[PDB]
Every structure is written in C-alpha cells, then in structure tokens.
Amino acid sequence: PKINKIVNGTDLTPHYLSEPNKEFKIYRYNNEVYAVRFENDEPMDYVLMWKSHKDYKELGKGEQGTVYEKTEDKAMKVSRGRHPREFYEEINLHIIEQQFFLKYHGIQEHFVLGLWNIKNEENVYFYMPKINAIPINKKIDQPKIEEFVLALKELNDAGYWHPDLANNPYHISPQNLIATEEMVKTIDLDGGFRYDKGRVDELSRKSLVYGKDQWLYVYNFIYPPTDEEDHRIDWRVPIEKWYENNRDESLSDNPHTLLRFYHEGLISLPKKLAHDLHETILE
C-alpha cells in the first residue's frame, strides 16, 4: 500500500544515482529513505535504506575510512579513496539490487547496506543505519551466530559474498560481525557484496570458491568441531585438501561432501542445517 505513497515523497535520486533514471529512484517518505525499483515505467517494489531526521562523533575507524554518527539512527563513512561520481553511482545501483535480493530472501536485517552520497563529488560519504553493539556470549548467544551464518549461506548460495569477513579458511575478520539485541549483523559493505564476473584467472576462480563457502569458514572458526578429548579439530585441513583435489568446486555445491565431513567429525554445521540435511535422508 505504501509504494504509491512513497513515490509521492521527496525525490533524492540526483544525490545518489545517475539522472534521469528509468529503473531506480530514492525517496524520503515519513522520515524513512527508500529505494524504489520500476518495471514497464511503473513503481513495482521498494526497500528501506535508513531512517532520516531531515565535529561529528566518531563511531569507529578502520584501514580505509572513518565512520561518524550523523544521527542516532544513521552512520556516515568517509572512505580514503578517490574515484569519479560514476564509480559510486554504479556501486549504489548494485547495492540497491542486492538490498532487494536480501528482502526477497528475508535476510536484509543481517546486513548493513547503504548508499554513497555524491551531490558533492569531492565530499562523498556512505550513509547507513547505525547499529549498537552489545556483548557476545558464544553459548548463550549461539542462536544469534547460527541465524547469521545461515543467512550468509543463503547469500553465498546465490553467488554473493562479503568482501572482508572470511576471505579464505585462514583469514577471518571478526570486527565486521556486530551483535545487537535480537541478532548478529555484518558491516563494512560499502562496496556491496562480491560476485563473480566471469573471469577465469586463478585468483578470481579461488575467490569464487572461497566466497561460496564463506559461511562455513565463519561458523567453524567460532564453533570448530570437537573430538572425544574436547579438543578442537582443524577443519581447514580436510577442506583445503578437498579444494586442491576438486578444482573449481565449492563444498556448498556438494551437500554429500558437507554431510560426509560432518559425519566424520571434520567440520561443524549450524544445528538447523545438520537437522535439515539429516531429515533429507530419513525422508
């Protein structure tokens, strides 16, 4: 019911996307900034981007930017890079499409996407919902991490992956996982998700394999398999040997591999995935 009301809001598209635009528009409607997509010259669907309140406080800093608190509900990242306006416009278009993917899979809440403001080409910044981190307990809050991992797997299964969360089985960036009251979210997505572009060099092919199994690396790093002696198993050894001997293939594309390794005690799996896989056999 809101689509026709949202398009009557304030059009912010020139501050984010190329103008004119046939496919996507940005509107502020009742203190909420939406992205609206079009088909056949008609508004079709929308996604929520952030809440609007239309020497900043520093929320944090990484290698490639500084994140400020624009409002109590919105964060603002200033990256160290220099690119043309069209570079950010293209990222924004892909982020909007990726936001729609997240909505259509019911996992938008687990990822903090946003848009690059480009109304000043020399003062570019990334708006996004501000989240509030709280303590992590691996046992008491295990469902939070489980639910995030399964959401990330849904992303990986579709060919998208986080650009800086778990690049390979030996690299994890836990700082990009944030626990809130209800769940775990992931940040540092101002470039959008990664995806394969059809390239066949060695690096690209390995990155695709690592990305599709990203969800597995995160889960096993936090909840590695345990043997009789309560000693953690190095899940990386069987997985690496598998990649070396099954070229250009991911474990996620082979559920029989996941179940076999899980049955042998080599890898861990979220409780619901183990249950679903085992239920697939009983039935």
Ligand X SMILES: Nc1ncnc2c1ncn2[C@@H]1O[C@H](COP(=O)(O)OP(=O)(O)O)[C@@H](O)[C@H]1O
Binding site for ligand IHP (CB under 6 A): 12, 15, 28, 33, 50, 52-54, 70-71, 74, 117
Residue 238 is a binding residue for Mn ion (CB under 5 A): no
Cβ proximity of 58 and 70 under 8 Å: no
The item of ligand X, Mn ion, ligand IHP, none sharing an interface with residue 176, based on CB under 5 to 8 Å by kind, is ligand X
Q: Other CB atoms closer than 10 Å to residue 111's CB: what's the count?
A: 20
Q: Of 62, 191, 224, 238, which lies in the binding site for Mn ion, with binding defined by CB under 5 A?
A: 62
Structure tokens at 31: 């203190």
Q: How many residues contact ligand X, by CB under 6 A?
A: 19
Q: Which stretch binds ligand X (CB under 6 A): 15-23, 61-69, 203-211, 249-257?
A: 61-69
The item of ligand IHP, Mn ion, ligand X, none sharing an interface with residue 142, based on CB under 5 to 8 Å by kind, is none
Structure tokens at 164: 């800086």
Q: Which stretch binds Mn ion (CB under 5 A): 58-66, 149-157, 178-186, 246-254?
A: 58-66
* Whole-angstrom distance, CA of residue 94 vs CA of residue 101: 10
Residue 62 is a binding residue for ligand X (CB under 6 A): yes
Q: Of 13, 18, 43, 60, which lies in the binding site for ligand X, with binding defined by CB under 6 A?
A: 60
What track of x and - describes contact with ligand X for positions 69 through 108 (by CB under 6 A)? ------x-x-------------------------------
CB of 54 to ligand IHP, least distance (A): 4
CB of 74 to ligand IHP, least distance (A): 6
Q: Which is nearer to ligand IHP, 17 or 152 (CB)?
A: 17
Residues at the contact surface with Mn ion, assessed by CB under 5 A: 62, 64-65
